[PDB]
Ligand SMILES: COCCCN1C=C(N)c2cc(S(N)(=O)=O)sc2S1(=O)=O
Ligand SMILES: [Hg+2]
């Protein structure tokens with residue numbers, strides 16, 4: 040059956056239809072801060088989200104995605120461990136049913152309440168479709184969310200959630216500024232990995248920021264009221280839409296900070 044996060048179609052079952060699930064560079068992974076290699080050759084990240092053009096927000100049955108117009112170099116990510124320019128195409132979150140879980144990546148086994156993923160594709164390849172067939176096609180900027188004070192930049196997103204409660208629903212979501220979701224520091228960990236959801240394609244250069252952003256419990260609570268199910272179907276709360284940590288195998292997590 041189509042994949043999900045439940046007992047019968049969750050992560051532990053993905054390998055059956057997506058054999059790459061047991062591959063060599065699978066994500067997420069536990070970032071062991073004591074084994075991560077500080078690397079001085081890593082340039083600082085260059086986040087140019089000033090001309091970002093958000094188009095809409097959609098509930099796809101696995102999470103809610105905010106999509107952006109990537110027809111041109113509007114919102115891009117450069118520098119860091121990247122060669123070339125990567126265009127922002129969408130961002131989504133993974134969250135849990137309780138504040139002590141939700142993130143996909145963990146830091147020294149610590150799970151955060153949620154994790155924001157800003158998906159970018161390598162312009163060198165022409166289009167998103169070609170990028171996903173390439174061993175450096177995607178760059179996903181991951182940001183952890185911890186329950187504390189409210190994140191004002193996240194409110195516009197929280198306010199529209201009622202309109203996309205169920206699978207398949209979408210709502211116009213223009214003029215959203217993704218910069219309001221960035222933490223203060225751009226320090227990060229980076230490693231070669233994959234999409235954390237099927238098709239689990241292996242070509243994401245993961246860039247996980249060190250500093251998490253704070254969101255109120257009320258803000259994360261609204262995430263938890265979404266539905267995996269489409270309208271008319273039995274209600275299944277959208278929570279715990281995260282993949283557990285995969286074995287690091289033959290990889291090293293580089294750090295841009297000491
Ligand atoms: C062949 O088409 C593949 C399409 C993959 N896309 C959908 C996934 N759910 C997905 C998961 C992503 S994540 N969470 O690992 O960054 S990104 C992302 S995605 O690159 O925007
Ligand atoms: Hg790939």
Ligand SMILES: [Zn+2]
Pocket residue numbers: 131132133156235
């Ligand atoms: Zn994700």
